[PDB]
Structure formats: C-alpha cells, structure tokens
Amino acid sequence: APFHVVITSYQLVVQDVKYFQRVKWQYMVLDEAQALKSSSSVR
DNA sequence: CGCTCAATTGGTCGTAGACAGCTCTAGCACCGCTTAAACGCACGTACGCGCTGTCCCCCGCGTTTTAACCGCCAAGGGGATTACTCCCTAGTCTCCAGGCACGTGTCAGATAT
C-alpha cells in the first residue's frame, strides 16, 4: 500500500464507512473501545 | 479634407479552472397488470334571439379662410464630458463563533408486556 496507517474518530467513521471500505486493512486499532458499549448504536 | 500622432480593438501565447463522460450506487416511482368507480360521449328534445328587408330622419363630411404652431435658423453661457489628481473601501481570506441537526447519553419514573 502507498501510505500505511490512517487515524480516525467514531463520529466521522459512522458517516464515512462507504469511503473507507474502498481500501482494505491488515490490522484494526480501536482506541477507548468502550465507545462501542451500546450494540443498539448506529456506530 | 488628408496627413502624424497618441491610443485602442483585436491577435497569439498561457495555464488551470470548469466542464461532461465515466463509474458505478441503490432509491424509488415509473411501467404492467388487474380491479373497480362513475361519468364521457352520446343526443334527443325544448323551441330561439341572430339576421332578413321596411320606413325616416341623424352624423359625417366636404368646403372655406383665419391664425396657432411645429420645424427651423442662429446664438446664448453653464454644466457633462475627458482627463489628471489622491483617498478610501471592495474584495481577499482569515479566524472566530453559534444555530440546526444528528447522535450517544442514561437512567428515571412514568406505562404497560
């Protein structure tokens, strides 16, 4: 891949997923993952 | 009375902006197909208030010759243009900052599975 690691936040990712899925990743890093505690969330 | 001169209108180079074919997505009302409502085209059937020539005087018109006026002649002097002089605010673009909308929040206290 031409550029390696991308830095993001949950408010962007829940809208931008359609763009991010245009590129594959080897590994996912998910920081303060308690942001995902609600399975009811759109996030 | 047709030149020389001081300036554009128009021509060639430039450079990146503003198109229009992708390159698909995926949301949706268009197209297909029966179902079903009710009135459109059909249409008698009542009988008419536009037009056809009598009788009689009204309005428009031609003619006439005054005399006001528009088209025109030239000049009058002050205010719009052509151009220089200088002062500011229109646009750039910036960061600040806040209303509308979306979303997680959460857990409470009002309602029901």
User: Which secondary-structure segment (H or E) carries A20?
Assistant: helix A10-20
The DSSP line for A5-17 is: -----HHHHHHHH
d(CA A6, CA A19): 13
Neighbours of A34 (CB within 10 A): 6
The CA–CA distances, whole Å, from A30 to A7, A10, A12, A14, A33 equal 10, 10, 14, 14, 6
The residues near A35 (Cβ < 8 Å, ≥ 6 apart) are A10, A43
Q: Please give the method by which this entry was determined.
A: cryo-EM
The alpha carbon of A36 is separated from its chain's Cα centroid by a whole number of angstroms, namely: 11
Chain B positions within 7 A of any protein Cβ atom are: 26, 103-106
Residues 4-43, chain A: which have Cβ under 7 A from strand B?
A: 14, 18, 35, 37-38, 41-43
The experimental resolution of this structure, in angstroms, equals: 3.3
The CA distance from A17 to A12, in Å, is 8
